[PDB]
């Protein structure tokens, strides 16, 4: 079980908010789960009993799972290399 | 406005076989970074 609230603060932005309008009928959404977010505990000691706890709340981490294979590049057409040639006059 | 029909509570369902199998498949993977004889437990966080 859980609860639903209308007004939300997504991208918290203390200075603004948004109101959720009602939706007619009923909603039955089906989706997938592709990843999880985990956070380690404190540095108590060298204990084999290690607990992993879900985190979340950071939007930057959400997109890091989809753009981890990409890296922008800057192309420099100019190039220099020795060669045996002479410019005639 | 007014509610038509019975009053229920929203909820969600997940298959037990699929969920446990995924955890059992990922738990072994994480042991490589930390250790082979490492006990793993999962918590649910608190008020935020």
């Amino acid at each position, epitope marked *: 079980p859980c609860r639903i609230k209308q007004i939300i603060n997504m991208w918290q932005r203390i200075g603004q908010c948004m109101y959720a309008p009602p939706i007619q009928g009923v909603i039955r959404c089906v989706s997938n789960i592709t990843g999880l977010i985990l956070t380690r505990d*404190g540095g108590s*000691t060298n204990s084999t009993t290690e607990t992993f706890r879900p985190g979340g709340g950071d939007m930057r981490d959400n997109w890091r799972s989809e753009l981890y294979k990409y890296k922008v590049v800057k192309i420099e057409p100019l190039g220099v290399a020795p060669t045996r040639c002479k410019r005639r006059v | 406005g007014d509610i038509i029909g019975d009053i229920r509570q929203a909820h969600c369902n997940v298959s037990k076989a699929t969920w446990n199998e995924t955890l059992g498949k990922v738990v072994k993977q994480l042991r490589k970074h930390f250790g082979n004889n490492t006990i793993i437990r999962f918590a649910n966080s*608190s008020g935020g």
Partner: antibody
Amino acid sequence: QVQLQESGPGLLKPSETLSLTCAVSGVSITSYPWSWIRQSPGKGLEWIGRIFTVGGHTDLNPSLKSRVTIARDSSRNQVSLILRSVTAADTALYYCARVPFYWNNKSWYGGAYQWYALDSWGQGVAVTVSS
Amino acid sequence: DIVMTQIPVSLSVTPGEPASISCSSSQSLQHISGYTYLDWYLQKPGQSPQLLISRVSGRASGVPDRFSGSGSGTDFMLKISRVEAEDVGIYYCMQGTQLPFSFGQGTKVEIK
């Protein structure tokens, strides 16, 4: 290793404000906090209260909530206990110790610090309350 | 406010003979989405008390190559691999679940 020392009057009189001070060693108050532990002959150990670098919560035993008090002083580098209305079973030993370990993360109450331990205990306080 | 029970109250054991002790509680010691807080303290007469076992099994530091306790709890237990000549004193069981951080009764030890 860091060793603590207890302080306070030796001879005490009944129905007097008992001020017991724990001599905080090199490790300052800003570091790991302390706590007060009560001893009692012929009975099990009893709890007094905790303390923190910034105080605040400072949970104490409900039984003696309205009688005992814990105060801190960064400048004096000492922690004191105020007690009045003594009882017959007050002729016992008082122990002062700290909490070594901590356990927290980014999800537990947003970085809240959890302490669960008792460090090396003190030498104890010997008292003799009588006429 | 909860009362602890220590069993056995009086223990006699020859050196080299492993010994076991138990601590019990009524309310479960499983913290809210956390661990179980319980420690064993040794009260050597004429010496300062020390902490030997942390959490439920974690050994902080020092001598504990001879003390080892585990188990979910309720009726908490502790085990000793071997008894050394410096194992003389009075034991103690402490529970710090939510409110009191109270202690137990104690248990004496006899050497042969």
